[PDB]
Structure 1
Amino acid sequence: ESKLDQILSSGELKVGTTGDWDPMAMKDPATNKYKGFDIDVMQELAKDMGVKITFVPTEWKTIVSGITAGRYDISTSVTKTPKRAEVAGFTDSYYKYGTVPLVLKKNLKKYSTWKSLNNKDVTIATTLGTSQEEKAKEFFPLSKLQSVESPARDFQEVLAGRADGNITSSTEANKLVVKYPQLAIVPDGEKNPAFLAMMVSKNDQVWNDYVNEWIKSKKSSGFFNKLLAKYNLKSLL
């Protein structure tokens, strides 16, 4: 009695999404249309299945519960975690991210390593009260900290030369180095690597297999790496 059967017979694929994640899954302000990388992924899957997508709004706090309860067939991208996998299935991953450091480009030879940013003479900008700030204290215990309060942005301090570096997700960094060509990712790998995947019911092997099969097929023609580039996004190796 797999969801695969129900999706094909009904002609409808139900997709749970928060719609508040630029540029993975957003709603267009005026029109209220869903757009973004995960939306295009789901459009392609429904096209290949010969079915229509139904978007089912949810929030971060309930999006996993929407899978467990059967409010939708599949989620948009979420971070795969052991805790989440106790209750939900995940598809294969198509996007790897982690924490990386940003500096001004001109200061690359000076700050080419994590260790170079961990020094009494270096200032690291952080955002006050965040997860990110706690990680900066872990990675750069010898450095001087500039902890600014939202809405002030940590990266703006780096732009202004008031701090030498900051850290953020590779996703955000990729976006920032696009917008501010004067910035660069310190090329010394990433910390706390993690993976985005779609959730499906933990108890429906047949549907889980079907989506993984489709992902494998798409990967063989570079579909996801091309779609990531469409959005100027890039997966870590």
Structure 2
Amino acid sequence: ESKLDQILSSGELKVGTTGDWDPMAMKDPATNKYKGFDIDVMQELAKDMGVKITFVPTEWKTIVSGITAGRYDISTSVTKTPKRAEVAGFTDSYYKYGTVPLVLKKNLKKYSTWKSLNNKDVTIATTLGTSQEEKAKEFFPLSKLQSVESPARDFQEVLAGRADGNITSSTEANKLVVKYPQLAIVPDGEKNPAFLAMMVSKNDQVWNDYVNEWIKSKKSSGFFNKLLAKYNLKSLL
């Protein structure tokens, strides 16, 4: 009666997801169906296990507690953090991201490094009161901050010329440079590397191990490379 055996014996995998993250897990507002990277991962897992999926909705503020309370067997992707790992189990990670700077292309050679952006002659846009803004103060302590109030977005300041650069996740940046092809990522590496993984209960260790082995097998078979590419996701190495 391991959680693994429970899933297998009942024919049912319960998956917690927020359904609000393009392209990882999106609930289509019309069809009610889920789609996205994580959904594909889960549908592959369930297929391989011979079980059906029950999607359990959750929100960002509650997705951790839903694991800990046993509302679902596994979550879709979330950032692995130490404080979460105190209360929830994580699978192996299959996507790595970090924080990167965006500038206008016209300014890419001028602002080719993190150091170039930490200067009293540089303006960094941020969103007031966010953790991202605290990070900007850490990375660019000499720079002027153009701190805009939500829901104004940092990157719009850069597009407008009211700031020289902003910072965001590589994930979001990779979307942004497609949507706004006047933007570029500063090619000087990523800060604060972080990992996406699935949560499982800390009490469901065999299930954790099962999923870890499955992920390793899917890495080797090229399944995750396929999916990454399908969603234009560029995992850091």
TM-score, structure 1 normalization:
0.95
3-state DSSP class of the match of 2:103? strand
CA drift at 1:176: 0.3
Tell me how large the CA RMSD over aligned residues is: 1.3
Deviations 1:132-153 (A, max 9, x none): 1121111111112211222322
Deviations 1:123-181 (A, max 9, x none): 11111221111211111111122112223221112112221110011111011011122
CA drift at 1:83: 1.6
Q: Mark the CA change 1:151 to 1:64 in structure 2 (over 3 Å): closer, same or farther.
A: closer
Give the total of aligned pairs. 237
3-state DSSP class of the match of 1:86? helix
Question: Within 2, Cα distance between the matches of 1:168 and 1:122?
Answer: 17
TM-score, structure 2 normalization:
0.95
CA drift at 1:94: 0.4
In structure 2, the gaps of 5 or more residues are none
User: Are 1:225 and 1:234, in contact at CA under 8 Å, matched by a contact in 2?
Assistant: no
CA drift at 1:68: 2.0
CA drift at 1:79: 1.2
Question: Within 1, Cα distance between the matches of 2:53 and 2:34?
Answer: 11
In structure 1, the gaps of 5 or more residues are none
Question: Within 1, Cα distance between the matches of 2:146 and 2:70?
Answer: 45
Question: Within 2, Cα distance between the matches of 1:179 and 1:222?
Answer: 28
CA drift at 1:30: 1.3
What corresponds to 1:167 in structure 2? 167
Deviations 1:49-81 (A, max 9, x none): 111111011222322222222221111111111
Misfit runs of 4+, over 3 Å: none
CA drift at 1:207: 0.9
User: Are 1:91 and 1:198, in contact at CA under 8 Å, matched by a contact in 2?
Assistant: yes
Deviations 1:169-199 (A, max 9, x none): 1111011011122211111111111111101
Q: Mark the CA change 1:33 to 1:125 in structure 2 (over 3 Å): closer, same or farther.
A: same
Question: Within 1, Cα distance between the matches of 2:11 and 2:65?
Answer: 24
Deviations 1:85-111 (A, max 9, x none): 122111000011111100112222111
3-state DSSP class of the match of 1:178? helix
CA drift at 1:231: 1.2
User: Are 1:112 and 1:187, in contact at CA under 8 Å, matched by a contact in 2?
Assistant: yes
User: Percent identity between the aligned chains?
Assistant: 100
